[PDB]
Amino acid sequence: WLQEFGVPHQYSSRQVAHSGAKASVVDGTPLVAAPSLNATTVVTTVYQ
């Protein structure tokens, strides 16, 4: 650190202690759906 002498700030750069509050954060809830039928088939002569 002494041989550094680059950014000493007397050990006391920013982020010095203080009376800080706390942040607040968000979130919600998702709903759901149900998919219906998708078939698409056809025949011609099913009777006898």
Partner: protein, 157 residues
């Protein structure tokens, strides 16, 4: 009509109705119990109108007079199809298309019986034999297509 080939009951079958045709064939088979295809008309009428066992009885009469007619077997197999005995229908369809090896509609009925039963490949041969007999029955070709798609062999379907 009277004293002639009274195909008028056939005309009513084309109309799909029964009453006049039904009594007409009754009167036929006590005036011309000579043809049996008329009795087949009767069995057919009973078929669509859900007169099942009457169809069966008249078919059995058809079996008296000429047990060589594959089509009585065809109708018997149809009866079995809507009354469960599908295996007997299948062996009847053997019997029929042994009697008339170049008959188409028997192939169709037995293919329906097969797909009801669960053997696909036999039905494939049914349809294919139909086709090599007739390359023009496009409806049966589409039926082929539905079966093959049910087997997931997409591209050739």
């Amino acid at each position: 009509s009277f004293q002639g080939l009274m195909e008028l009951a056939h005309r009513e079958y084309q109309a799909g109705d029964f009453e006049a045709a039904e009594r007409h064939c009754m009167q036929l088979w006590r005036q011309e119990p000579d043809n049996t295809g008329v009795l087949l008309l009767l069995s057919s009428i009973h078929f669509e109108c859900r007169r099942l066992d009457r169809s069966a009885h008249f078919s059995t009469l058809a079996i008296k007079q000429n047990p060589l007619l594959a089509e009585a077997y065809s109708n018997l197999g149809n009866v079995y199809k809507e009354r469960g005995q599908l295996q007997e229908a299948i062996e009847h369809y053997r019997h029929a298309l042994r009697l008339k090896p170049d008959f188409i509609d028997g192939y169709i009925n037995l293919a329906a019986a097969l797909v009801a039963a669960g053997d696909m490949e036999g039905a494939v041969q049914a349809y294919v034999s139909a086709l090599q007999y007739n390359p023009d029955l496009y409806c049966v070709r589409s039926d082929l297509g539905n079966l093959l798609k049910a087997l997931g062999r997409l591209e050739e379907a």
